[PDB]
RNA sequence: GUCUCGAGCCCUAGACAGCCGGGAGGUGAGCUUAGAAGCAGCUACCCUCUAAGAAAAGCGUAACAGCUUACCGGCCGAGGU
């Protein structure tokens with residue numbers, strides 16, 4: 001099969017072997033797209049994903065490559081934004097961005113700060129009780145957002161009573 | 173060609189003398 | 202403004218309570234001219250254009266109560 | 272998991288899925304009941320407006336409300352089941 005993806009005017013994309021770099025006004029994203037007998041190339045103004053094989057496994061990845069490239073197109077133009085809200089019951093939770101990592105202090109009354117590192121060119125902006133995770137790479141942004149929610153994971157006690165934590169409010 | 177679609181085209185042709193695809197089918201008539 | 206259908210039937214019938222099983226147990230009775238009086242009153246309540254179809258909506262409560270038409 | 276073969280049905284008069292929009296009135300059916308208004312129970316399950324819309328399929332409420340299912344319309348476009 002062969003699927004042709006038309007590149008937007010804001011965007012310009014180059015290809016080096018199996019790696020595809022996608023540049024735009026919001027940034028640049030380089031992804032490696034490697035799978036048996038699937039050739040991904042740039043035909044001037046279109047990105048072509050093709051294969052001689054049409055089996056269920058090849059078709060699975062052609063559709064995955066399509067969505068990855070379309071996502072990179074959206075990332076370098078409009079960007080990717082995940083909105084998060086910080087909820088606390090008894091203990092005042094201090095969420096702050098210290099360097100290239102987001103630190104959470106005094107969670108459930110803990111003396112020790114919980115922290116996670118931000119993935120790549122992702123920017124995390126805090127406005128009091130609201131947090132917005134943004135960037136061009138959906139892989140990096142989606143993870144950094146997830147990492148913040150996963151950072152307040154509680155396995156020891158009941159999650160229904162101890163609901164403190166930063167949760168994903170908006171998904172793009 | 174379902175029988176309800178044929179009877180619906182005949183109902184729309186009746187109200188032109190006196191789905192968007194069924195209106196277009198009736199307009200061509 | 203105008204009172205419900207269930208109440209307007211009980212005024213020109215003489216009976217208050219309905220039945221446990223409708224059509225199988227006949228309670229009240231209405232005539233042809235008695236349904237034409239209830240059709241005149243409900244104009245903003247009903248969505249019908251003609252006076253003929255306005256009567257059919259009142260009958261849609263009658264036979265499902267125990268009211269026979271003669 | 273994947274490959275191959277057969278059968279039935281649906282489909283450019285636009286299928287399958289998704290998303291948007293509509294999901295209206297008589298009337299909150301009646302009985303039961305302090306109340307019960309799709310949705311405790313019993314019985315019935317009728318007709319208007321219309322392109323659809325149950326006397327309501329599933330949650331939800333003390334009862335309402337609120338959320339959607341059926342059903343109809345739009346966007347989309349090729350196979351789908």
Ligand SMILES: [Mg+2]
Nearest residue numbers: 155156157158
């Ligand atoms: Mg324990």
